Design a protein around this ligand. Structure first.
Ligand SMILES: NCc1ccc(S(=O)(=O)Nc2ccc(-c3nc4cc(NS(=O)(=O)c5ccc(Cl)s5)ccc4o3)cc2)cc1
Ligand SMILES: NCc1ccc(S(=O)(=O)Nc2ccc(-c3nc4cc(NS(=O)(=O)c5ccc(Cl)s5)ccc4o3)cc2)cc1
Lengths: 524, 524, 524, 114
């Protein structure tokens, strides 16, 4: 296929056009008073959304160079959201600002590598300042407070989140499932969660939020790397006859008779999901055996001669539900026997006591934690159905916010933290002049979120930015109530993880954007 | 007429294109290894020149806005040559470089006024450094050395210049005229010079150097403003029947009936020039009476009732030769009586000794100096006419260079003083960031002369610039012979006045042209 | 007017196209087998010629920049013909070849100044080789042989030339004029010649060779510069009533009221030409007084108070005929008295014998030689008028060739001396690589004349060039009869002056043309 | 051998006196020598500095003295740890020469029309 190649200024201006289109699409949905974006679905009536990621998903330009310029920003900005729970729009706005300023500097003719180094230095210093400004949130009162604030000031959601955290532990696994009535329920069911996302994104279930759920699935434990379909056929027929979902944790499902075929051909015949075996080597085998004990299944290992051709439905495991997202995978509640699971935990604890190096100690401690800890499940309930679904949505939003807060603390939101750290990092200087200009670019681009929020509200960005910068500490501006004060007290806060991740990822996007020299793409 | 108006960056880019065209045309002649420029002439064979002044004069562009830029740069750059005798090309190159960098910065979104202030501050500091670095040239031996250096190591020219300066004084009047044989001549004759240029540029005589010469002219002195042609017609007829040239020294010539008629109607029938009387008020009358005494004429004044129509040839003054240029008029050798001039000088000295204020003493003393100083005229001799004219041109160039040197000392030539003062000001700072950007712009375009000179030589400008900046003092790179060392020792030197004037005028052009926002012109 | 400016390779290619057009037009007439060139004339039938001078004169191109290239080549090439009497086509061919190769080398990325220096060094070495290779022509027999060779082996022309040079001296003045019958005549008459050409090219008389002739003219001698037409009006009326031509010898004629009027207004009513007086200073006055003594006129001088308006026909001088060309004016036969001329010559010889310096002795001796040498005039006789004019043209061409030969000897013709000196310099080296490339460019274009001559004959230029280079000394190739041998014996020879002048002028054109960077011209 | 293109610049500097039979061979030698400076010039340009000054400074040195593009410092490249096997440089030089020789002496080019 013939390629189209561009160098120098043309490549950078095409990239800038793409990033500008994407940012102008997503920046208008930022802030408590964001505008609306009319997303179009060819089926019927259009979709009105104030959500940033929903808008960013559809954006795909015509021109190939601009399309790539938008795609890189969208990709490396989605990491902030899927690693912190929010910040896609903030990361995109920061990336747009840094990219446009750096590209103008490069067009002015200054060493791009020095600019990238200066931007990285400024971002590192800003991250340190954000760590300095964080307000710790570990007590149950603070946990409940953040839970309420995230879920539109609903005390019941905060109470439920606090109860779940004190039951399963601050580092434990919490999942919110459906409910049966007005009352909400909480229970610690036995389960585990390992960080292996879906193989193919087309495995996505009905939820469009990058999630897959399988009610009463089948767990197949193939420790070896599976590539052929013929020895799958007995298990496929058994699972089809049973009708329950089928989840295959395995060493790796390759681009062979599996994966590719399972995506399209099994798209709507038997519901399935694909995840890799957690760990590697002996760790992978141990994970396989623990999952077999948990889900009541048997490990089909070729090392002792057992062959996936003969895999009875009894060898298959099953649980109440399994949730597979982009990176993690949780088993809610398997059908394993509590006595057998307890015995396995006991023997692994013995292995802990007779461990040799600290590495073995910590890995086996993780084993016993995942085994014995279990999974706490919140059963959100309400009066009507729609009330139920809306409250459930509020619940997982609050859960993600609370997890981020208890991880890295909480800082004033609404873009005030970035403006504060940018104001305090005024004396930062680099070796050469280009590094200094890069520091200036990063510092000025840290003001984009607050300015865009104020502009979305319809006020004058400059006056509000000056007033907020003139203050100190957590003093900022409430875009909702158009008043000034300590953003923490008045209920406008943000987890430190979200802001730090957004800033760092935007810096990475800008660094990769500025130092580019050539783009190769297929011609129209 | 309907106008065409442009705002913002459109005017900036048109301006930049015009200045780029003019500077690209001019700067290729810079340095001892300057290239050739072919200028079209409709009379036949083209003219091949290495003179930047002619190339700048011939430049005129089609597009009106680019023509604005070129004309403004040309007009303000020619002032450096007029004031110092050299430095048009250097001023043009400096202006182009500062202007390009400033326009790029302005397009990058910086306050133009702060940029202009920073450029002005940097230029002022560089001027102070240049004044600190200059080597004085006061003794006769240094004067002769500078004359020889400016005259391509011709010891005879330096000896002649030194003798003339010793005879007439360092601030006296020295004129170069045609000799009558092989041996050179030097003598002092009665005359005076006042800083009043020609009224109309269309008065230019045979020489292309911007000067006029009248051989044995008649001098008319009228303290009254003259605007209609009726009152001096008998004087014009008398001077026409005489056949000798006529010079107008009036209070002012208004373009109602004189300037138009004298310029257009008179285009070969006679040879007439008009200049304004020096000074104003009673000082103007004193100057006119002194001129009349020196030239043997009489003052036509309305106060005494003397009327122009009755002025005869007796009232007209006579001189051997008069030279008028852009901003200076000199009388070489009048026909006045020695006794009358001496008596008037004694009377003015008596007025000096009975003066009562410093201002009166200063003006009367400079009047006496002008009257009694005389004019030292140099006659150039050679074997044949062609070498005669070449030596005359060399002598006048060396005289201008020596006058500048004795006025303000000498520095290292070849655009090395500018790079020295640029190196010495690496730590300059301004009020804010924009002033710092302006200072950096200023101390990055002062290397343009040396880089252009090296580029004309075919070498690598960056290597030579780094090597020169590595050294200290007058150490530089001799472009003529491709070697390093002390310029003052090799005989490469420029007067401090020419470098300072070029830098200041280029800074003025850049300041006026960066802060330009709107441009108005006639339609194409 | 709005100008059009081109930089870099654009000017180079436009200039190359113009030079290529002119050289392709001219070079096809080179050699004894030159082709024909048809020049259109609006009066009727076209003109078919084999003369390169006419073709070069008629060439003018549409595009302005190509016109620059052609005009500069034509200008600097015609100087060779003016100085030596022949060699315009050879200079044009050499210039075209050197310029083509040099522009190719420059486009290959080489320092143009180094290329120019190498070309100049190679040309200097070749000039030394040519001076070493020349065969002297001093004795009368050699003079006659060269005259016959230049006059198509006409022994009568050679005998006449030898007799003329014997009678008047090798450095005397010889003129060819019309005879009165069949037998040729030769006599010595009083006259003088000074190197002052016509002031305006529009003074050209009937002949197309660039000269003017006045039959029994009147000579006006005015040491004063003339710029207006009033004061010699009575002289003009007197000369118009007389009806004989009038010749102007003044210090300088300015284009204010004479040159414009004398050229445009005078276009057939009278016949007048104007030339500058020889010398400058007191030497100019001596020249004028000698001319007045020789022609019987009187000097109109302002120093003695003599004024032009009172100059009668008695003051005017008279001669039999005067010839003026581009850079020489000669008086053939004045009407001055023999006794007065002899007395003045004796007085000047007395001044010589009482002279005190070498310069004075030299100038006075050349004055005496000019005054007392006389002019030897040759009258051409033939059976009919047409053969008469053809023989006169042959005689003047042979006279020019013989003068060049006796000035600087003779070498082998047919462009073989150039190939000899090119072969002898195969081991020339420069300072750096670019200078060596310059040498190679120079010593590859000196074969262009011989290759073009052979190509015009229809043979193979490479074979003949190799065969000639294989020989040594004066051995060469005869294009007329297609044979080899010592061409000095075979009757093909050229004066060393014409070859040296063509080489040097072509080198000058190439040097000015390689180092050209910017070009300015009016819009189309 | 010293890496970072310093070995090629060093051998090109050493081979200044190389000469051929005719003039075209000499020009080919000059072309090859000038081309062996491309790696260092391109590396310096990628770093953002001025290629000419660094190239002149490295060529003026001797032995393994070169330019460390990572730390923007001069000295012995072997000691700082900027190394390159002789095979990697020799094979690249020879193969580039082969491509240039095959592509210079080409005269005709036949391909299917668009
Ligand atoms: N060492 C290479 C080199 C080359 C040339 C020169 S030069 O002095 O000849 N010319 C020159 C040209 C442009 C600049 C420049 N500074 C910029 C800054 C920003 N950041 S920004 O947040 O909008 C912003 C910052 C401050 C504001 Cl006010 S707005 C964006 C674009 C900029 O362009 C600077 C200098 C100097 C140095
Ligand atoms: N025997 C055939 C023949 C034909 C014509 C003539 S000719 O003397 O009439 N004209 C003529 C024209 C071009 C060249 C020439 N030398 C070159 C060299 C380089 N190498 S390069 O590393 O860039 C480089 C080397 C030095 C630099 Cl400085 S840059 C690249 C292009 C070059 O073009 C030479 C001569 C002479 C000989």
């Amino acid at each position: 296929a013939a390629k189209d190649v561009k160098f120098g200024n043309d490549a950078r201006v095409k990239m800038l056009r793409g990033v500008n289109v994407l940012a102008d699409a997503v920046k208008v949905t930022l802030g408590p008073k964001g505008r609306n974006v009319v997303l179009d679905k060819s089926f019927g009536a259009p979709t009105i959304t104030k959500d940033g990621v929903s808008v960013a998903r559809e954006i795909e330009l015509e021109d190939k160079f601009e399309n790539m310029g938008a795609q890189m920003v969208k990709e490396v900005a989605s990491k902030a959201n899927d690693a912190a729970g929010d910040g896609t729009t903030t990361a995109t706005v920061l990336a747009q600002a840094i990219i446009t300023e750096g590209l103008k500097a490069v067009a002015a003719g200054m060493n791009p590598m020095d600019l990238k180094r200066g931007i990285d230095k400024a971002v590192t210093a800003a991250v340190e300042e954000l760590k300095a400004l964080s307000v710790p949130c570990s007590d149950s009162k603070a946990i409940a407070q953040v839970g309420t604030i995230s879920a539109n000031s609903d005390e019941t959601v905060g109470k439920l989140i606090a109860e779940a955290m004190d039951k399963v532990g601050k580092e434990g696994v919490i999942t919110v499932e459906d409910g049966t009535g007005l009352q909400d329920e909480l229970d610690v069911v036995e389960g585990m969660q390992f960080d292996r996302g879906y193989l193919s994104p087309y495995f996505i279930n009905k939820p469009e939020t990058g999630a897959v759920e399988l009610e009463s699935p089948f767990i197949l434990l193939a420790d070896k790397k599976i590539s052929n379909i013929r020895e799958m056929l007995p298990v496929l027929e058994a699972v089809a006859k049973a009708g329950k979902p089928l989840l295959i944790i395995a060493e790796d499902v390759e681009g062979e008779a599996l994966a590719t075929l399972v995506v399209n051909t099994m798209r709507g015949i038997v519901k399935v999901a694909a995840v890799k075996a957690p760990g590697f080597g002996d760790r992978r085998k141990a994970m396989l055996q623990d999952i077999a004990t948990l889900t009541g299944g048997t490990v089909i290992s070729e090392e002792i001669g057992m062959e996936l051709e003969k895999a009875t439905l009894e060898d298959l495991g099953q649980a109440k539900r399994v949730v597979i997202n982009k990176d993690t995978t949780t088993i809610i509640d398997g059908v394993g026997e509590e006595a057998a699971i307890q015995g396995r935990v006991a023997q692994i604890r013995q292995q802990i006591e007779e461990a040799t190096s600290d590495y073995d100690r910590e890995k086996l401690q993780e084993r016993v934690a995942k085994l014995a800890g279990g999974v706490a499940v919140i059963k959100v309930g309400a009066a009507t159905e729609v009330e139920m679904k809306e409250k459930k949505a509020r619940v997982e939003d609050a859960l993600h916010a609370t997890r981020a807060a208890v991880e890295e603390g909480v800082v004033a939101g609404g873009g005030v933290a970035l403006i504060r750290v940018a104001s305090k990092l005024a004396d930062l200087r680099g070796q050469n002049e280009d590094q200094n200009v890069g520091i200036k670019v990063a510092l000025r681009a840290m003001e984009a979120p607050l300015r865009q929020i104020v502009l979305n509200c319809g006020e004058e960005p400059s006056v509000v930015a000056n007033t907020v910068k003139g203050g100190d500490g957590n003093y900022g501006y409430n875009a909702a109530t158009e008043e000034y004060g300590n953003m923490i007290d008045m209920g406008i806060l943000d987890p430190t993880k979200v802001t730090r991740s957004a800033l760092q990822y935007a810096a990475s996007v800008a660094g990769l954007m500025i130092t580019t020299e050539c783009m190769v793409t297929d011609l129209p």
